[PDB]
Amino acid sequence: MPRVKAAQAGRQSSAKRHLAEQFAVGEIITDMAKKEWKVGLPIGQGGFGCIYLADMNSSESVGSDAPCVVKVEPSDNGPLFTELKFYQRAAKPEQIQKWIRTRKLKYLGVPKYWGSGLHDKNGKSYRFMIMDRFGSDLQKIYEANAKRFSRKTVLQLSLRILDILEYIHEHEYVHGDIKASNLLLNYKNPDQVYLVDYGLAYRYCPEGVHKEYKEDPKRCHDGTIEFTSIDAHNGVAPSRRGDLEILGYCMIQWLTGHLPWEDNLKDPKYVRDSKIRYRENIASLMDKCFPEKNKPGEIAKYMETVKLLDYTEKPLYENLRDILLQGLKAIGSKDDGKLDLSVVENGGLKAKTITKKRKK
Numbered sequence: 158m159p160r161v162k163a164a165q166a167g168r169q170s171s172a173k174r175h176l177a178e179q180f181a182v183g184e185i186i187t188d189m190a191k192k193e194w195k196v197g198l199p200i201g202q203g204g205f206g207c208i209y210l211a212d213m214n215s216s217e218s219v220g221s222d223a224p225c226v227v228k229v230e231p232s233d234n235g236p237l238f239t240e241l242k243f244y245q246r247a248a249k250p251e252q253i254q255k256w257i258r259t260r261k262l263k264y265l266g267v268p269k270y271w272g273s274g275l276h277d278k279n280g281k282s283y284r285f286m287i288m289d290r291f292g293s294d295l296q297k298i299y300e301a302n303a304k305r306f307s308r309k310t311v312l313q314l315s316l317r318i319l320d321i322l323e324y325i326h327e328h329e330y331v332h333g334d335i336k337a338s339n340l341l342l343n344y345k346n347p348d349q350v351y352l353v354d355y356g357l358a359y360r361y362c363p364e365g366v367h368k369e370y371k372e373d374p375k376r377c378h379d380g381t382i383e384f385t386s387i388d389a390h391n392g393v394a395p396s397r398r399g400d401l402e403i404l405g406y407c408m409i410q411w412l413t414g415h416l417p418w419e420d421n422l423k424d425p426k427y428v429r430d431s432k433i434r435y436r437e438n439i440a441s442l443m444d445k446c447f448p449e450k451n452k453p454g455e456i457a458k459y460m461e462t463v464k465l466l467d468y469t470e471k472p473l474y475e476n477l478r479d480i481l482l483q484g485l486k487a488i489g490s491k492d493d494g495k496l497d498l499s500v501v502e503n504g505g506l507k508a509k510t511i512t513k514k515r516k517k
Contacts, residue, residue: 204228224290240355295340297504334380348495397472455484
């Protein structure tokens, strides 16, 4: 006496053609700078979906086909508001190079900003923003490459993401979702990874002042538990320990190309039991996933160290970066020149809004 049942469906159509209602490639978008940016070919990546190139024609001496694009968002001012806020707030050549050079930072893994604008579609204000020229994605590359990256890449990315993660963590936002979906590359430059999709911004410390674990008791689940880690999965702000922990998980997953708990990440209970069970002796789990394929140590120690200090004691960029560079350079290899993710995939990344109170 079995029992089965199910169903599903879906569709969507649209079309138009007439004056003041038929936009297309080459269209001129007016920015807050009172200018006119021409839209180029479609992209779909580089912002929040449905992104179109920018600066098609030339105004004075072409600059490498004018590597620029413009993302378009719906009239809501929700996720784009926050993302754009910090995006433009932390965007600047002189500003960045200033603090970066003054603090000897390992470069900033953030996209370049130029300007923004909104076009009122009679009842629907379409907001858009111009940024660097992107095309590749870490979510797609890993999909076709089966997260089969070398140590050089894992280290390079980890380092970059770390620097940026700190510069922002010292403000009031942290990309709890380190998922590759937030990692994008240049339109055709593998030696340049930028972290976009700030929509997953999670206020680390309230009013700039940290607070004991007790933010979202109902699991803020800002993003996919897969990368959200126990921190975000528990609604608690990743006070250093969380950020680092997440980076470690994704790091080993990239070097291994497969995750044990991942296959069982379908549910939260599993992800939790896995995090704890693996936390008990991450060292054994790290060495277990790699008997003798390469050299599991940088990630093993890095993680063990991040949890060896405490749940929320204090960060250790120098210490972590030390063990990481030590194990990575221990093999006599480091800084091949740029990166090792030029597989050229180009897919369709994703995004989401910040967790707090608004999602209706």
